């Protein structure tokens, strides 16, 4: 009689359950085990997983957003996995920013295994930058280059072959709960932070001089006319669609866009579109105090009430290990969490994927705080209010500061009060 494992996942791929079943079929056959998968929508998964955690009833393994690992770990419900991580190559096998997501900030033991990475780089229309007299090497080297290329792109008379209309220099989604991830590399590039440690404790640094320098740099590009009004009312998926449809010279996204450029519109790609035929990518530019690439993605964790910790740890080793890492990265359009998988020919043979790997070298993530959730909700609320000012062309440095002082007061309250 087959042994049993349960895994909870979020919709990471086109057929989430079927794809995950294909991924683990070799493990099932090797260990005489059936892996039962349950797919949770990203919006409900957190509450289902905290109910599972507190009730002691749920799967053996659960997917976690990297930003979730601290909160769940602090609940005391996760089995240590330093053994699994040592088996996969240890701390050297991971980008530093990925290794940071294996534990609660400052915790003694690892409680999550890196599964896949989300990271962001600039896609750009090679035809638009040429028509504008912009060298992508200079546009994506520095903030000065970045703004100077957007200026030339706003001036350009170039029209998309299919829309027969000019392109927005830059598109960025003004309407999303994931707005912080888009701001983070500007905050970081200026020497800033969203939170930082002081007086025995974590606090907001959103109102620091450097954070405010980076936020204003980024948000002010929109008030300078480089971002259309229309973008700031749109979500991440709408902005991707705008870039495929020739509306945007430049936008930030993950590696998944490359695969979409290879497949026809009917298959949910955009290979027929001008943008697919004129596609470049660049890492985020260096800011005044450094160059940072936002990283997110998902990790896997083992509940301490699992009835088969050794077999589940074999599944964590399989899913975290070289073959599964390359296959699931293909299925999801993500970057492997395991550094060694970046050397796979399926990344090295595509120059656009090679660029994502160059951008990966600058990877940076949020501190893995037990209270990150509340921090991010408060930051997102106030960032939303800053974009409103940008839409009316009313974002001053002073008005930005007043918004971030307000966010900082609420974040510091949240951090002080984080339960248990």
Ligand X SMILES: OC[C@H]1O[C@@H](OC[C@H]2O[C@@H](O)[C@H](O)[C@@H](O)[C@@H]2O)[C@H](O)[C@@H](O)[C@@H]1O
Contacts to ligand SO3 by CB under 6 A: 15-18, 39
Contacts of 274 (CB under 8 A, 6+ apart): 125, 127, 160, 161, 162, 246
- Applying the rule CB under 6 A, the residues between 67 and 106 that interact with ligand X are 67-68
Among 239, 279, 344, 356, binds its own copies (CB under 8 A): 344
Q: Give the nearer residue to its own copies in terms of CB position, either 11 or 225.
A: 11
Find which of its own copies, Cl ion, ligand X, none residue 110 binds, CB within 5 to 8 Å per kind.
its own copies
Residue closer to its own copies, measured from CB, 276 or 359: 359
Task: Provide, rounded to whole angstroms, the least separation between the CB of residue 178 and Cl ion.
Answer: 10
By CB under 8 A, what part of segment 50-79 binds its own copies?
Answer: 50-51, 54-55, 71, 75
- Which residues inside 41-60 make contact with ligand X, applying CB under 6 A? 42
In the list 189, 283, 296, 321, the residue contacting ligand X (rule: CB under 6 A) is 296
Instruction: Determine, following the binding rule CB under 5 A, whether residue 231 of this chain makes contact with Cl ion.
Output: no
Whichever of 145 and 297 has its CB closer to ligand X, that residue is 297
358 binds its own copies (CB under 8 A): yes
Binding mask of the shown chain, residues 297 to 336, with x at each position contacting Cl ion by CB under 5 A: ----------------------------------------
CB of 61 to its own copies, least distance (A): 19
Q: In this chain, which of 34, 83, 147, 405 binds its own copies, going by CB under 8 A?
A: 83
Out of ligand SO3, Cl ion, its own copies, none, what residue 15 binds, judged by CB under 5 to 8 A for its kind, is: ligand SO3
The least CB distance from residue 144 to Cl ion, in Å, is 19
By CB under 5 A, residue 194 contacts Cl ion: yes
Q: Hey, which residues between 116 and 175 contact Cl ion (CB under 5 A)? A: 172
Residues that bind Cl ion (CB under 5 A): 172, 182, 193-194, 252
């Amino acid at each position: 009689m087959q042994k049993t494992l349960e895994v909870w996942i979020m919709p990471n791929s086109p057929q989430p359950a079927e794809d995950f079943k294909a991924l683990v079929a070799p493990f099932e056959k090797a260990h005489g085990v059936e892996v039962k998968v349950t797919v949770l929508d990203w919006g409900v998964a957190w509450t289902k997983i905290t109910t599972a955690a507190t009730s002691g009833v749920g799967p053996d393994l659960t997917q976690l957003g990297t930003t979730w690992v601290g909160a769940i770990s602090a609940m005391g419900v996760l089995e240590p996995v330093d053994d699994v991580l040592e088996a996969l190559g240890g701390e050297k096998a991971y980008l530093p920013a990925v290794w940071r997501t294996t534990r609660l900030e400052g915790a003694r033991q690892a409680t999550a295994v890196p599964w896949f990475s989300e990271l962001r780089a600039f896609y750009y229309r090679t035809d638009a930058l040429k028509a504008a007299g912009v060298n992508p090497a200079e546009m994506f080297a520095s903030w000065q280059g970045f703004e100077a290329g957007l200026a030339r792109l706003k001036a350009s008379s170039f029209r998309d072959p299919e829309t027969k209309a000019p392109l927005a220099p830059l598109c960025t989604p003004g309407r999303t709960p994931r707005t912080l991830h888009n701001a983070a590399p500007w905050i970081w590039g200026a020497g800033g932070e969203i939170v930082r440690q002081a007086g025995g404790r974590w606090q907001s640094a959103l109102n620091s001089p450097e954070s405010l320098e980076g936020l204003y740099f980024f948000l002010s590009l929109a008030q300078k006319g480089y971002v259309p009004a229309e973008s700031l009312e749109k979500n991440t998926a709408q902005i991707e669609a705008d870039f495929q449809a020739g509306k945007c010279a430049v936008f930030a996204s993950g590696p998944w866009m490359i695969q979409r450029a290879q497949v026809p519109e009917a298959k949910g790609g955009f290979a027929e579109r001008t943008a697919a035929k004129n596609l470049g990518v660049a890492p985020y530019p260096a800011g005044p105090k450094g160059r940072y690439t936002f990283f997110g993605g998902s990790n896997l964790a083992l509940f301490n009430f699992s009835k088969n910790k050794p077999l589940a740890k074999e599944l964590l080793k399989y899913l975290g290990g070289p073959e599964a890492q390359v296959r699931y990265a293909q299925m999801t359009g993500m970057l492997p969490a395991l550094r060694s998988a970046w050397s796979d020919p399926s990344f090295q043979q595509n120059p656009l994927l090679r660029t994502f790997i160059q951008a990966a070298q600058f990877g940076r993530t949020y501190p893995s705080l037990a209270g990150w959730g509340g921090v991010e909700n408060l930051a997102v609320q106030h960032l939303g209010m800053a974009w409103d000012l940008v839409a009316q062309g009313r974002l001053t440095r002073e008005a930005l500061k007043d918004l971030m002082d307000k966010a900082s007061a609420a974040i510091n309250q949240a951090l002080r009060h984080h339960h248990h």
